[PDB]
């Protein structure tokens, strides 16, 4: 949801630049979207936020 800065990469113009991870917009717009998200438990199984 918030997005995360992970680390730097070397763009093709030679300048060090940033790498971010975030949900694609369609899956983080509305409170019903947060139900789509699965965590996984200590057993390797996916559990939904709901």
């Amino acid at each position: 949801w918030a997005s995360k800065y992970v680390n730097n990469f070397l763009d093709t113009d030679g300048r060090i630049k940033k790498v971010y991870v975030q949900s694609d917009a369609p899956f983080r717009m509305t409170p019903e979207d947060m139900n789509i998200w699965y965590v996984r438990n200590g057993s390797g199984g996916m559990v939904p936020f709901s």
């Binding site: 093709t12 113009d13 030679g14 300048r15």
Partner: protein, 50 residues
């Protein structure tokens, strides 16, 4: 004399200048730069050309 005829290494003897920061009065100092993000290879191609 001894080391101009020397295959193993390049040996430059010299008397240090009194105030080295001045270099030589006839001297010039130039910086060739990659202004379009063209890369190391392109910049050294330009260096060798120049």
């Amino acid at each position: 004399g001894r080391y101009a005829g020397y295959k193993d290494a390049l040996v430059i003897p010299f008397n240090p200048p009194s105030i080295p920061e001045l270099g030589t009065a006839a001297g010039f100092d130039f910086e060739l730069t990659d202004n379009a993000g063209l890369g190391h290879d392109a910049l050294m191609a330009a260096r060798n050309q120049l």
